Design an enzyme around this catalytic site. Structure first.
Site, PDB file in Angstrom:
ATOM      1  N   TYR A  85      -5.951  11.747   0.213  1.00 11.06           N
ATOM      2  CA  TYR A  85      -6.412  13.068  -0.161  1.00 11.06           C
ATOM      3  C   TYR A  85      -5.146  13.907  -0.300  1.00 11.06           C
ATOM      4  O   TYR A  85      -4.583  14.366   0.703  1.00 11.06           O
ATOM      5  CB  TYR A  85      -7.304  13.622   0.942  1.00 11.06           C
ATOM      6  CG  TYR A  85      -8.150  14.800   0.543  1.00 11.06           C
ATOM      7  CD1 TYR A  85      -9.537  14.740   0.659  1.00 11.06           C
ATOM      8  CD2 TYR A  85      -7.572  15.986   0.060  1.00 11.06           C
ATOM      9  CE1 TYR A  85     -10.336  15.837   0.296  1.00 11.06           C
ATOM     10  CE2 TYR A  85      -8.364  17.080  -0.313  1.00 11.06           C
ATOM     11  CZ  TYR A  85      -9.737  16.981  -0.198  1.00 11.06           C
ATOM     12  OH  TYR A  85     -10.511  18.060  -0.558  1.00 11.06           O
ATOM     13  N   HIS A 110     -10.012  17.412   4.569  1.00  5.92           N
ATOM     14  CA  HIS A 110      -9.583  18.748   4.983  1.00  5.92           C
ATOM     15  C   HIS A 110      -9.433  18.750   6.502  1.00  5.92           C
ATOM     16  O   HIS A 110     -10.353  19.106   7.248  1.00  5.92           O
ATOM     17  CB  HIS A 110     -10.588  19.812   4.522  1.00  5.92           C
ATOM     18  CG  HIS A 110     -10.426  20.228   3.092  1.00  5.92           C
ATOM     19  ND1 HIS A 110     -10.488  19.341   2.039  1.00  5.92           N
ATOM     20  CD2 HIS A 110     -10.229  21.450   2.541  1.00  5.92           C
ATOM     21  CE1 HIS A 110     -10.318  19.996   0.903  1.00  5.92           C
ATOM     22  NE2 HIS A 110     -10.166  21.276   1.178  1.00  5.92           N
ATOM     23  N   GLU A 341      -3.746  33.414   4.414  1.00  2.71           N
ATOM     24  CA  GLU A 341      -2.769  32.625   3.637  1.00  2.71           C
ATOM     25  C   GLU A 341      -1.958  33.451   2.625  1.00  2.71           C
ATOM     26  O   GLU A 341      -2.075  33.257   1.410  1.00  2.71           O
ATOM     27  CB  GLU A 341      -3.480  31.436   2.962  1.00  2.71           C
ATOM     28  CG  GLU A 341      -4.152  30.521   3.986  1.00  2.71           C
ATOM     29  CD  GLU A 341      -4.861  29.334   3.371  1.00  2.71           C
ATOM     30  OE1 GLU A 341      -5.121  29.329   2.153  1.00  2.71           O
ATOM     31  OE2 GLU A 341      -5.186  28.390   4.130  1.00  2.71           O
ATOM     32  N   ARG A 356      -4.868  35.792   0.083  1.00  9.99           N
ATOM     33  CA  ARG A 356      -6.070  35.091  -0.333  1.00  9.99           C
ATOM     34  C   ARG A 356      -7.287  35.853   0.205  1.00  9.99           C
ATOM     35  O   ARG A 356      -7.312  36.243   1.366  1.00  9.99           O
ATOM     36  CB  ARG A 356      -6.056  33.650   0.202  1.00  9.99           C
ATOM     37  CG  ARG A 356      -7.415  32.956   0.205  1.00  9.99           C
ATOM     38  CD  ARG A 356      -7.277  31.497   0.593  1.00  9.99           C
ATOM     39  NE  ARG A 356      -8.583  30.851   0.740  1.00  9.99           N
ATOM     40  CZ  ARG A 356      -8.748  29.552   0.977  1.00  9.99           C
ATOM     41  NH1 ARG A 356      -7.690  28.759   1.114  1.00  9.99           N
ATOM     42  NH2 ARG A 356      -9.979  29.047   1.081  1.00  9.99           N
ATOM     43  N   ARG A 407     -12.102  26.879  -6.914  1.00  8.42           N
ATOM     44  CA  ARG A 407     -12.146  25.577  -6.240  1.00  8.42           C
ATOM     45  C   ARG A 407     -13.230  24.684  -6.839  1.00  8.42           C
ATOM     46  O   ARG A 407     -13.183  23.463  -6.713  1.00  8.42           O
ATOM     47  CB  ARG A 407     -12.369  25.773  -4.738  1.00  8.42           C
ATOM     48  CG  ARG A 407     -11.494  26.852  -4.079  1.00  8.42           C
ATOM     49  CD  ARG A 407      -9.987  26.525  -4.172  1.00  8.42           C
ATOM     50  NE  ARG A 407      -9.618  25.376  -3.327  1.00  8.42           N
ATOM     51  CZ  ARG A 407      -9.414  25.445  -2.009  1.00  8.42           C
ATOM     52  NH1 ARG A 407      -9.533  26.604  -1.354  1.00  8.42           N
ATOM     53  NH2 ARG A 407      -9.098  24.343  -1.338  1.00  8.42           N
TER      54      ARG A 407
END
Ligand code: SLB
Lengths: 670, 670, 670
Positions: A85, A110, A341, A356, A407
């Protein structure tokens, strides 16, 4: 009845005119939009246009822009293709001495399971990329915790990285450490080496060397006795001078003034300096990196686990002398809710920070600038609740050039619901913001490429990238998926990357021209056999040969094996076994278990005529656990020949008598 | 004297005008043909045109069409690059849940030697393709017979394939079997799981699940105790419901209505269902696949070994309940001579079938449609004896879009002789046929790409492909060669793929736009190290590391080998030997045969100071077949120390006496 | 005030007009230069132009030309990607039977260390290239000397190469040898095989076969008894006829006149013929190759170590009968100073030769033609001291088309200093020279592509290439670097290719259209997994499988290993050890040295219940150097059980007594 032609003013509805043009023109014609922007009610067949931009409100009141080919001078590249990933370049990319670095994390999810902080690099301005390199090993306390990194960059010729330790269970931060290491360089220098008579040390003048005691240094053509080959830093005098210990001394002073010589340094042969910062309070993630000057840098952070959120930066004013010393600086409180972030960069005394946004239904990404490294700020909110994406950026002239990616498809807009668990084509955008005008009200997000979100799990590796400039090109390195399901829901809930197609997330790079290119093209079509990862050469015998050392850590099945002469001036073939112990054993045969055994032979064949043999018989053999020792001599050296137990086993038997025993004395019978 | 300009009407001879245009224009100018068709007496320099079609009669009376770049929105991709003879996608391609599948056969020849039914897949709409997967093993009775497949597709979430058994000697059909297997899927579902109190089974409602008893099912977030993780189907209630056995039971009923959960299924973890159909009489090959409905499908076939030929289809009306039940339906008798390998597809209640013609000098490919699954037909003959190619196709709007390839250059036309045993550039064509008009008299075959036919053997892997549509793109997957000779006539008559360049046949995909593309481009340049087949990572020590399990079945030569700790919480290194027995032996040394031996050691070095040793001496050693056992203890456990034979060998010798023997009783002498 | 537009006459200063055009036009517009040449004072943004050439004097008085995209129909390819220092195609490239060969040297430096003469090949007209093949092994006297080659080509179906031996220390020539080998071919022939009654030889008529006694020949379908399969040449009768020895004889004459059959030949299965030419006096390098006729060829050479320089050629008039016979022919003395590495080609009775200039401050490259194979010459000097590059070339129509590359940026011009030790973008040029006009005064060097010079060492792999024509395309194969430092100054002074990114030099190919292309495009995008070098297939079990034989010569670390059944009808697994002896040993454990041992077992597990065991204990074990032999029988076959030494060790001990000894006679005590 008069017909209207396309106006290309971004306000007139050009849908009818463009429809008529497409209907009336051959499908192979490239329709030139002359660099204009055309308002439409739906996106037309974009593939038939060049040099055209469309403005379209998919959601009424939220215009976004869409680029045909050639409108921007730019191109998308795929830069990793690995079963891990591969995602989260955020926000680690940098350029050093002509090489573009795209650090990321390769995991199985994740989270930090199976995770290595990694990078790929480009040595040709982004046309091709290197075999992935692991920058971190699995944490010593794996699988309880593992490493994580979203902040990395270069200050005075050293790589600096915030290496976090996080739990596999919850991705909870447990520790922050600053790791740093000298970057590899070759230096072609004149003078600067002195060595006093009657002692063994030499002083090396290399401005801003960035080395510490113990770091690797290599010397060539020094013209100073003993300063030669692979060495290490013995002392650091100041930021411009260090010493090395030579193996010898001379009766006169040495000084190579006016003489040309070569140094270099090595990332791989120097250790990390690791500075434990503990569990920094009120931090969820450290993210992004801004070099400030010759002494230090800032790293972004947010806290988002508990109310209230924090967003800001940590400034390390002197990371060389004082890596443990930093100051926390927050953005204004009104911009901290629903924020994370931050991306930070420093240009001409101005620190820029972009957040973000975490929610499409609340105020989103905001931009901030400071002339005092985050003590005071001027701020702006992007319209329409920009969310779910980081906005890495660079400054080119008067513009910040920022990139972001939804996303999954149709998530960008304010009020747009998350759209997961199905395959889609998420949009990637860029925008320019003029720093003099300092107003984002009329910002124009331009869709320049679309990615794939696979949909087999809720999470997305799309986006969350990083931006660098090299020469006249800007590079956005970011994630994208493909349609291959990881089978998390299916036969691979364990998320093993090496089953089936592994994990669909991989890295891409959008390379965009940002200024004139005053040279003939360097572009090539890649037509070579990729031969870096597993370098293969057909030998003179016609057999594929791999001369590189390699490690195979996954389970291996081998056919016929020959161990070639390799060791001690090639006198011997050699196998070494590691661990506490080695085990060489024999599987239970599928078809003839009654034959289970291994024949060990000092000669070339199964016939004992070819060499001495010992044969170990398996329990499943008809002759269960037999051993046959077959040689023309059996010589027991260095010790008595003994039974393991006392007075339990014999020498020989009634049907297996030894002819006699040759002894130096009568048997001792008791 | 007036000059004529190019008319682009497909009738005026535009040769002179185009010649003048090319002579009078810079070589770098792209001459735009404005989407028109230009009649010419010879093909001009096509590379200098865009958006132009030429009509040219290479053979008088047989016009064919030739596309410049950009006339069609399309692109050729190379999709395999393997040493096997990779050919015959015919007619197996399909799209399932966003993935494009290109099945084929990888062999060493036109035949079943070394053959695996294989596929490659694309998860990015054809830009990149996966590492080949073997779908079949070598037949248990190899090398007498092996598998073969030209019919494959999906019906109700299961892959179905006609797996044939054919002789290596003659490629003669010996057996037909229908093999089927569930396709891998992730399902994101709400409700549908019930579990009655005081018993262990749960009922799972999944419409059209396509699963059989024994198939793999994985569960996540079910909110139903015991329905979790990897499971199998226990019973099938009906097409929409099945049960699983949980490990437990509860005192109350459970029902997850209104709760979101996840299934999936697995191709790899479910067995094939194999239905033996025997040697179906009057069949040469089964070829092509048309899904009819939720219950079944048709497969094409022909018989062409003996007169009279048959061509038609087998319809399996209920392949789920009755995989052995099918009905044979032939095309009209007048279309069966010189015909084979029909392509079949089903759209809106119409079954379309297109034949391959076998001769350029007899009536060739014909097209047929039926509204009763092949009981009655309407038919058309393509003009000019289309031959040697299958014509896979899809229906888009009112058009059948069909693709074909000549197998070597200049074979397409009626009356054209075969042109083998020399390298050439065979033409690939497509054509549209409007189903309402139902007349092929004026069909326009458009040459869109040229392949290579190598010429080292008579056979050609060019063409014989398969067609699918995904979104607004059509894909023709087909074979093509390169100029590398397989050396069948030469040093590789055995056709070993792993010598030299192996076999030149590999797969290509022509991706053609067939409708509007209303998104920004997804296209990328591939710049990554391909890292799926042999995934390599530079470890933190700078050494190439492959973490995937792998099987090396070809003969291996290894240099210095270290077996790392790997097994039982990494306590040990481990080598296991399979077969009836293992053999570890020692080659006859080339330079010093007198030293032939293997030293086995419990320690790190050749010196016995490092560990106990046993040394087996080869027959070629000066000390022929000696064994030296060298330890600080020699302990014989579990059995007597015996000579192999009776009263033949001794303990010790006159120059090798044991000091004494420690015994519990006097020697037994007889 | 009137404004001037761009004139595009190569004389008017068009800088202002082009600047205005670029300022006034959208950045995405492709500005068409209409094939004209525009004089400018600096190069503008070339990327925004198509079909445009610029003329620019970077150094006043030295105009050079610069091509935008599409001005030339051409494209750059990258053709190797290997960690070796891959450079010096000079001057070895050739085309044979539709395959393009790009020979080169892969080393670790400008020298013969680690060097293999190598090639890559293209079977698709340059779109893709093969896995590198080693043509030479390391010299038997490595590391004192090794091989080197800059002259290679084909004459009458044989590869000929001047294989030089040079010192590693100084790259000094020690030996010249002519090596030759038949090229692999398949021939499809009618008649020509005769076999006289009552004897075993057959005569094979194959015009210009180029075979010698001992060369490989394979036969199929000969229709002549015993002429079949793999054979060798027994005798050569003349250039068109040879014989083979069959295994049998017949009572009647055989003759296959009128019957179609197949031969071929094999490069790999035929030995080199090696003709030692000794140390040819007054030679530094042999370089370039010109086939003259059916009997022989010329090779270029220079002597440049001592004054005076020589430049010229060696003509081998009959290389088949007399490979050791050649004649030295020099160019005129005035062209020999500061000259080296001549490129030579032969067309229509004219031998053309172009030199490399060695200095930018002295007269440089010159061109020569001869109608008597170098006995007399006509000559021309290129203006402006062309230097540091070879000028490989081909003749197309009335033009020589030549290619060259500066080795680092801004070195091309007369008087330009060397610019090393820093990264740059060197220019590659081509030029045309009309042979009728025979004047280079107005030659136009056109910059068509830029490469990278890395700068980490003084040496450059850029350029020094080779040129071939195939069909309507010309190919320049040459070196180029990337920005990855080899770390010669740094951690890799040993120049190990397999550390880090190895050596940045790799090969490129510029493919340029030189005549009409009368076919539809063959171009494809490569989307396959490259699967030739390490062919991987996912097996039916889901595991990556490599069926090719392979050699791993670098140090290997392996995890869990299974040796599969492979040998003698797959009855056994097998490991063979080479060298004088094999060694299997056990590393000192890191964590528990007290456990150091290897367990050898005839069964599947570490428990002795699974099979007979011998355990060798390491010196570090608590039971230091113990051996435990554990079986249900211990049978000593073929020899006495003896102590190694006399009267030193015992049978048993006080705490390890054997129950008794079964003997055929009383112990012999002395
Ligand atoms: C890994 C290892 O040393 N295995 C050994 C085991 C263990 O010592 C024992 O099971 C206690 O754990 O016992 C022996 O079987 C035995 O006594 O015959 C032999 C075997 O070599």
């Amino acid at each position: 009845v008069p017909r209207g032609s396309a106006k290309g003013d971004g306000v007139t509805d050009d849908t009818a005119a463009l429809t008529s043009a497409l209907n009336d023109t051959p499908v192979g014609q490239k329709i030139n939009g002359n660099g204009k922007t055309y308002k439409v009610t739906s996106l037309p067949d974009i593939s038939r246009f060049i040099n055209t931009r469309f403005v379209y409100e998919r959601i009424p009141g939220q215009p976004l822009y869409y680029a045909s080919e050639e409108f921007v001078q730019g191109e998308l590249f795929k830069i990793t293709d690995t079963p891990y990933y591969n995602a989260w370049p955020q926000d680690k990319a940098f350029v050093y001495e002509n090489v573009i670095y795209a650090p990321y994390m390769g995991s199985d999810r994740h989270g930090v399971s199976r995770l290595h902080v990694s990078w790929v690099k480009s040595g040709d301005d982004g046309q091709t990329w290197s075999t992935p390199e692991w920058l971190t090993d699995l944490h010593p306390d794996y699988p309880t915790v593992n490493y994580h990194c979203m902040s990395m960059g270069v200050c005075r010729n050293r790589l600096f990285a915030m290496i976090e330790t996080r739990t596999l269970a919850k991705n909870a931060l447990t520790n922050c450490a600053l790791w740093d290491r000298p970057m590899s360089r070759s230096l072609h220098l004149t003078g600067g080496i002195t060595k006093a008579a009657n002692q063994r040390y030499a002083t090396i003048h290399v401005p801003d060397h960035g080395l510490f005691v113990g770091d690797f240094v290599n010397f060539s053509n020094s013209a100073v006795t003993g300063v030669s080959g692979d060495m290490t830093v013995a002392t650091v005098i100041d930021k411009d001078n260090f010493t090395v210990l030579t193996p010898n001394q001379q009766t006169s002073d040495l000084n190579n003034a006016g003489k040309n010589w070569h140094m270099g340094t090595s990332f791989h042969k120097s250790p990390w300096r690791k500075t434990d910062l503990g569990l920094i309070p009120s931090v969820t993630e450290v993210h992004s990196f801004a070099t400030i000057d010759n002494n230090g840098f800032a790293m972004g952070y947010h806290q988002g686990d508990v109310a209230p959120r924090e967003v800001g930066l940590f400034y390390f004013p002197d990371a060389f002398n004082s890596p443990s010393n930093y100051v926390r600086r927050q953005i204004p409180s009104e911009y901290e809710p629903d924020a994370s972030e931050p991306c930070i960069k420093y240009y001409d005394g101005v620190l820029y920070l972009i957040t973000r946004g975490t929610r499409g239904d609340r105020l989103g990404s905001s931009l901030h600038r400071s002339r005092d490294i985050g003590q005071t700020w001027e701020s702006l909110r992007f319209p329409h609740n920009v969310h779910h994406t980081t906005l890495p950026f660079a400054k080119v002239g008067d513009d910040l050039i920022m990139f972001g990616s939804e996303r999954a498809e149709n998530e960008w807009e304010a009020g747009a619901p998350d759209d997961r668990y199905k395959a889609s084509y998420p949009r990637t955008f860029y925008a320019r913001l003029n720093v003099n005008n300092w107003n984002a009200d009329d910002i124009e997000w331009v869709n320049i490429t679309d990615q794939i979100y696979q949909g087999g799990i809720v999470n997305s590796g799309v986006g969350v990238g990083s931006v660098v400039v090299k020469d006249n090109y800007i590079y956005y390195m970011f994630g994208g998926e493909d349609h291959f399901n990881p089978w998390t829901y299916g036969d691979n809930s364990a998320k093993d990357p090496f089953k089936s197609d592994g994990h669909p997330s991989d890295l891409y790079c959008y390379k965009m021209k940002i200024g004139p290119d005053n040279r003939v093209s360097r572009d090539f079509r890649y037509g070579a056999v990729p031969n870096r990862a597993v370098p293969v050469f057909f030998d003179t015998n016609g057999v594929r040969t791999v001369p590189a050392p390699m490690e195979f850590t996954g389970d291996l099945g081998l056919g016929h094996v020959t161990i070639r002469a390799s060791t001690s001036s090639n006198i011997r073939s050699e196998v070494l076994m590691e661990g506490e112990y080695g085990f060489i054993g024999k599987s239970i045969p599928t078809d003839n278990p009654a034959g289970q055994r291994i024949i060990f032979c000092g000669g070339e064949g199964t016939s004992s005529t070819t060499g001495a043999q010992i044969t170990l018989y398996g329990a499943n053999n008809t002759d269960s656990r037999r051993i046959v020792y077959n040689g023309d001599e059996h010589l027991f050296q260095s010790a008595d020949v003994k039974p393991y137990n006392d007075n339990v086993t014999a020498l020989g038997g009634p049907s297996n008598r030894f002819t006699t025993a040759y002894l130096g004395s009568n048997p001792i019978v008791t």
